[PDB]
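request received
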Amino acid sequence: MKIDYLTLFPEMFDGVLNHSIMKRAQENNKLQINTVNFRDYANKHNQVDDYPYGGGQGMVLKPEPVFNAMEDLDVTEQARVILMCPQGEPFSHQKAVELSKADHIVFICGHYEGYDERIRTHLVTDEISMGDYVLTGGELPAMTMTDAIVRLIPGSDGLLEFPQYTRPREFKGLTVPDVLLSGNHANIDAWRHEQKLIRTYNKRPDLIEKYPLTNADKQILERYKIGLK
Amino acid sequence: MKIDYLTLFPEMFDGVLNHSIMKRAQENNKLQINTVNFRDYANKHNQVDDYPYGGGQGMVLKPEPVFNAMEDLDVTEQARVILMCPQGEPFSHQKAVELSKADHIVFICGHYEGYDERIRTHLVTDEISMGDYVLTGGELPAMTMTDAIVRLIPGSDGLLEFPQYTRPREFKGLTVPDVLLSGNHANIDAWRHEQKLIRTYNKRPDLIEKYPLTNADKQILERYKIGLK
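response:
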């Protein structure tokens, strides 16, 4: 697979493109992750931005530059063109899975108060948001999504996790549960299972309602609450 | 406000810390956004990582280094310590709002198969996830969240948005709706309102069910569907 980022700030990507566990695939000829400076496709004035027909307070991303960029990037039909949007589908795993299968992805990163509809109908294949929160630009989101998608290339049990501890045993008066140093694995497993139940009960009672509790599980919770008195 | 990132890859941040619309506040003495190299707090071996008591296949982030880092960073009580986690609360706007009010935030960025529970009980104040998708590290998430929080410092109408267009009027046979060039603002507003209704009807019927439709709105939808025949 290969990935292109058409952005006005290709520099934002230097730190991440290299120094992250991203090179696993880059050096392994699995993928080409390269940045594209969008100002190369701009027009009298080298702006990729222009006024809205009908009026409005914001500016709108022009169609021409974007179509041109897609041209030389040889985006075929069956390449994925992603627009970073607030009203886009919030990104998810089923979506990360779907994308890791395409052989080519292009991200329109710049945040504009508007996008020419012709770009949305003819070029863009997926519109994606990160969550109900509002961001200043689409480059971070594009990088975050790349991570999730790439690391899913080739190369819960319904409860919260059991608490984990490492050395030292005692630190500033904070001691690791004795059971963990006992070497008795049936007791360590049982204790972790109890902690998972209890933590879920205290912090994600919704998860408990959708967990098929065994009689022993109910007895653990029952005595736990009696211990709180 | 001030923000610290304790990470093993401070380089990932160079591109973003500067070149994004982040400098608005940095140069304006509103905030200090600086990176901290976590390997400065490491132990015989300069690892921040160590084996799990009780056994397990992954490694666990040691408590000592993290507590030390929080010490010299002068994290007071009433500073926010954030751990990037999969089971953390997915990040949201209400959370972005809450955080933009704190005067100091520290992000533990490294992804480990485990975190010593003492860090979670004594240091960490918020545990946050990005969504059900799994990421390779916590630095991108920390940067994304910073963006949403910072830009919310000081410095929907229930339907999908109306489609936007800019020059040129005709491009590759793709023409901007005539109404937008007509200069008749009551017609432009009505047309946009119709498009919002129609698009929402076709793509987010759930939003239509929670919209207080007027008689005129129902007539727009009604004739639209008759136009589809």
